[PDB]
Design a binder for this molecule. Sequence first.
Ligand code: HEM
Ligand code: HEM
Ligand SMILES: O=C(CCCCCn1ccnc1)N[C@@H](Cc1ccccc1)C(=O)O
Ligand SMILES: O=C(CCCCCn1ccnc1)N[C@@H](Cc1ccccc1)C(=O)O
Ligand SMILES: C=Cc1ccccc1
Ligand SMILES: C=Cc1ccccc1
Ligand SMILES: C=Cc1ccccc1
Ligand SMILES: C=Cc1ccccc1
Lengths: 449, 449
Amino acid sequence: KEMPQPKTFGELKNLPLLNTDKPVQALMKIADELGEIFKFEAPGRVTRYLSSQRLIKEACDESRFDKNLSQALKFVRDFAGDGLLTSWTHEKNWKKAHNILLPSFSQQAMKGYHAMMVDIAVQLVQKWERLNADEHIEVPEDMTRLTLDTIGLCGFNYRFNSFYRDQPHPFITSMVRALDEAMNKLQRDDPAYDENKRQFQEDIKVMNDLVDKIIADRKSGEQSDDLLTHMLNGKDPETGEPLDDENIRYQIITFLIAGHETTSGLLSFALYFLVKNPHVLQKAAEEAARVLVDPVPSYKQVKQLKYVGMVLNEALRLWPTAPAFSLYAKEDTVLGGEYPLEKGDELMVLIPQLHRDKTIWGDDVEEFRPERFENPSAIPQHAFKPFGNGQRACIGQQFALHEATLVLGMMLKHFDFEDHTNYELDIKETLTLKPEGFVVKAKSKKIPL
Amino acid sequence: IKEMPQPKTFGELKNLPLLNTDKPVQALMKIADELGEIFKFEAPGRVTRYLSSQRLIKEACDESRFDKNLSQALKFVRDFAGDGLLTSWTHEKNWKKAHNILLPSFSQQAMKGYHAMMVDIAVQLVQKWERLNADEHIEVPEDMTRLTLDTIGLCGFNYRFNSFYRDQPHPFITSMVRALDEAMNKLQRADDPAYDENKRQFQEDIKVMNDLVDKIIADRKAQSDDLLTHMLNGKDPETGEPLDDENIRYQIITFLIAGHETTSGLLSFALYFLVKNPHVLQKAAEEAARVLVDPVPSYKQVKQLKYVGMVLNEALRLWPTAPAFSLYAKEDTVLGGEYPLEKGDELMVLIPQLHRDKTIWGDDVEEFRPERFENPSAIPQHAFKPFGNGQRACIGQQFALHEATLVLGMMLKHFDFEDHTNYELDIKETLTLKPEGFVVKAKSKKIPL
Ligand code: HEM
Ligand code: HEM
Ligand SMILES: O=C(CCCCCn1ccnc1)N[C@@H](Cc1ccccc1)C(=O)O
Ligand SMILES: O=C(CCCCCn1ccnc1)N[C@@H](Cc1ccccc1)C(=O)O
Ligand SMILES: C=Cc1ccccc1
Ligand SMILES: C=Cc1ccccc1
Ligand SMILES: C=Cc1ccccc1
Ligand SMILES: C=Cc1ccccc1
């Protein structure tokens, strides 16, 4: 009944606890001490952090709780607008865009995106085959090059050409800088931040201008197998209305934000766990070698990379790269039979803690064991939520998994990998998670493309 | 590409008389020793191929290319098991329905609720052995069948077969074992030479089985947390429908068939290998004593019997008590790059031969070494298949291992064992395998319950 709460800082309450450069990891350690639920207070804010499957299975009841915009999502809303990620469920553009865009994200739609994903994956492989001896790979940097180009090409037929660059593209310099200012507002109205505010607005213009220009450019009349084409021609069956031009821009910005970082973190964590668990890497490499029998993987071959998928899911279990989502109570209700909640009360789902629920997973929760995911139907309901929940779950889940399976499968086919530094896991936190400074050496197996 | 070997033939009867033997699996293993990883086996009206190498079976386990087939054995068991989970085709609507409804009651989390009833039966077996007089011996498979049959009755539908109060088995299982015996006999009949007595007996055997079950279902409908309760109150999330009363009785018969025989064979082979390998017995007894520190084991203590679990996995490697399953090709495909298969072509997986693949386990394949299973990541994919494959794998796997671990643990804690007759392994073959005539002496350690 009485809810635990971590240490306070006077009038700032719990907020200075987030004034740290690893806040998710700080929140995990608080859950380790306090258990399945703790109250987290800030000036003007009250929420509760959930960590057990028993409580989260209830928070996930869509009849009782809806998606809430966390403070992080409200700041991203300043440039993602009413895109799909940062809109409320009752907002008319959510359901409209949801109905128009769901078909472009089905497993059936990945048959059309596959060729462009292979385009960028081949560039990654060729980059690595062209390294000189004893040169190394900066893994998260190269996975980010791959994911951003993949979504740019598949989403709106745009080539960021990240593998031709050292300093990232100007659009993503401002975009990453906007996301960086959003996270900083969390752990902060002084005049010293006025520079950041003026810089934030100029970053929004850089983003809107490039995107709004592409929308105007295409509207040429050309038709391509990309999200942008479906967004100019699609009509919501419900209202019979197409998305208006402002909403298309928000979706494009949204897909770029939601696209690259979460997926590049997954690939980066997957490769870290492979080089730290050589038996698992051997099993994944044997699968890649025997399934990917052509110089260019096909869509069907990728679907046969079952163990590669298990590696991906277990990497998502330990470090889900979009590590929380937020909910509010639609009506007065009782949580777990012990925590009465009022209408509008907020919950945070701490995904990495959920995924360490010993009562669900047994006691070896910290060990990387893809064999946990041999039979996916066996996993209890709402114990594994890397892609969120319900109708507000990740619309790009199939896209992200198909890209990551394809790319990891090709990496494992084409190179042997060496953890030549004995890399010490160091998780850098933005709004997403990635293993900072992770480096490897790749020895080519000299298989042609 | 490669011409497939085939064992000796008998004119128009082809290979079928090779199965007219009282140890057909063992005969099939010796054929595999002579012919290798794959051989064609022909019968009047039937063609199948027996696989014995991990290299071919890892492709056969690809669910996009092969689905579960009903062997001739399972087609005959279907005459009284109906469309229960074990003898239904994957495309049958009652398979997926019953599968979705019954998975939560077979989860590792559900074993916490069965545990008390499992201990109930384990204590009965322990007390039987401590009440033996000096120089009396234990009939091991007989007592393990008493235990597993009572555990599935109690945990499954709150019915007490009271096997430890009986000399002659329960009337329901008299026909149940006699129906299984007729099913196996139909396999090895070179027929219709006035077999009507067997036919008339088969029908009366079915009637005994349905009547007892149909009454238990009728009795209950006029709450106990058992499989029967979940089956009356469970609704499939997909179709939203519950199981009908006909299918419920097929499931009950199926669990009684599939429950006890395979699991009692496992405990029996496990104890045989333990008394034939005294260092392994000692090591498992030492684990039992330091883990089982209470007079009654808890669910958590059973999960800590790690070496006992490896002992069970190693007995399952040498003598998997459900020794084959059947698959069919969903589409034309090539097996191993050298054996073209047409859509609908059948495969048999000879599990005990698979588990003797020297390229997987080394050259000492015949030695009992539980340490092979310290890390599941070290085992190549699909090398170890005692519970079948994929979505048609054994649903009762966690039930069987928890029961067998609890019971073996209590056995090792409470008694020292003597292989007083220097027992010579003699494997009796039904549809399952057991060590016939296996007897031991147990000297009590005098630790109270
Ligand atoms: C290119 C890949 C991806 C795209 C295009 C994408 C896009 C999106 C979009 C549009 C939403 C909002 C959906 C809605 O509310 O209607 C969303 C939600 C979400 N996504 Fe993704 N996503 C991608 C990859 C990923 C990855 C790899 C992960 C995690 C490992 C992830 C985790 C999530 C989560 C947890 C949510 C729910 C957030 C919340 O409830 O507030 N996404 N995604
Ligand atoms: C109380 C214990 C057990 C129960 C309740 C049980 C039940 C079942 C059921 C219902 C199925 C069919 C699943 C489906 O197709 O949806 C099945 C399959 C299977 N079981 Fe079990 N079982 C038990 C113990 C065992 C043991 C101890 C073994 C072997 C050591 C075993 C080996 C197998 C195999 C090999 C299959 C797949 C058969 C095939 O593919 O044709 N089971 N079991
Ligand atoms: O916990 C989090 C982390 C969630 C980040 C997820 C953003 N994402 C998801 C998918 N792609 C991006 N955010 C809280 C922190 C906070 C709590 C109380 C008071 C102020 C801030 C919030 O924003 O409310
Ligand atoms: O190989 C086997 C042994 C497998 C029995 C499995 C029994 N079990 C499995 C799970 N629970 C019970 N059975 C073949 C024999 C046969 C082959 C060719 C032609 C005729 C007969 C079959 O009947 O299909
Ligand atoms: C007597 C042992 C035996 C071994 C293999 C096949 C049939 C019988
Ligand atoms: C939806 C059909 C189906 C296919 C395979 C397994 C279970 C159900
Ligand atoms: C050995 C099987 C058995 C089962 C119940 C009672 C007596 C014997
Ligand atoms: C340690 C024994 C072993 C077990 C399985 C695969 C390789 C080695």
